[PDB]
Amino acid sequence: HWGYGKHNGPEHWHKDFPIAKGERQSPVDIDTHTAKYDPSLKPLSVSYDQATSLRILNNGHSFQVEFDDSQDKAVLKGGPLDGTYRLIQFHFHWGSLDGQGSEHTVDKKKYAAELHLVHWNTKYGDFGKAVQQPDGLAVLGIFLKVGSAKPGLQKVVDVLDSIKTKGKSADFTNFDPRGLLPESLDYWTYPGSLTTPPLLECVTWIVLKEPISVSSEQVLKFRKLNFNGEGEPEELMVDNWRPAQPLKNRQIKASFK
Ligand SMILES: CC(=O)/N=c1\sc(S(N)(=O)=O)nn1C
Numbered sequence: 001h002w003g004y005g006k007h008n009g010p011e012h013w014h015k016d017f018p019i020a021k022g023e024r025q026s027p028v029d030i031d032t033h034t035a036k037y038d039p040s041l042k043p044l045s046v047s048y049d050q051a052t053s054l055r056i057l058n059n060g061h062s063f064q065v066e067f068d069d070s071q072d073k074a075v076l077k078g079g080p081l082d083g084t085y086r087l088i089q090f091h092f093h094w095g096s097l098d099g100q101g102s103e104h105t106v107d108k109k110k111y112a113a114e115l116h117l118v119h120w121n122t123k124y125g126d127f128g129k130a131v132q133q134p135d136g137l138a139v140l141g142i143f144l145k146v147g148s149a150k151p152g153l154q155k156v157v158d159v160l161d162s163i164k165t166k167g168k169s170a171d172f173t174n175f176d177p178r179g180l181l182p183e184s185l186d187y188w189t190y191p192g193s194l195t196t197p198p199l200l201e202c203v204t205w206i207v208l209k210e211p212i213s214v215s216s217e218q219v220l221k222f223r224k225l226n227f228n229g230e231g232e233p234e235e236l237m238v239d240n241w242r243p244a245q246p247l248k249n250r251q252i253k254a255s256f257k
């Protein structure tokens, strides 16, 4: 099975998922001096006031918080998007050390972690259909840097002990994802892919310029999770990030000058 270890990590994925060597793979390095300002780009519209969180799960590759996406409760619109995209879950990627952990890089700089807010395009009716379309998903990427604690993240950090191993889940209601956003919504955007298998090239990536800061104690907690299931030999959940992929025939656009 695929993973992030030496024998089943990102450089092995292409044997089971040949699109790994595809034309619009993610993540990528964002070169700030060659990104193109596009003033036709609209401001992002984030409407999370009615979000309904349900559950948090250790999926063996990360942990994810799931939302009710049965109606237009929490949606993303605007930006480079046409149409409305519903939030279905968020998850993180992080490192073993503070100098690594993000998937995207900015002028080759890595961040300590990267938050992904995953949304799907409601014109396709459900998530499984949306991933088969080039404009099926929109993922909001937010960088984490180590510094001062983020209050809005503590409720997440506090329940990780209850989902330590693969396949564990816990009730996680009334979580407000607005507490995870930076102050500014300026962004870069490019067409790309899911960054874990099946690596489908169905994503409009929206990567926020401004990182959020978390404390060392907060990220430490991330690092105490386990890839393994209960009763199995312990393998700490760290470095669950894919390296930057070739940009190839793509342009990164910026919403800001
Ligand atoms: C949200 C979901 O069900 N899946 C995902 S989201 C994703 S990511 N990391 O956001 O590009 N990769 N995969 C496989």
Ligand SMILES: [Zn+2]
Binding pocket: 091, 092, 093, 116, 195
């Ligand atoms: Zn992700």
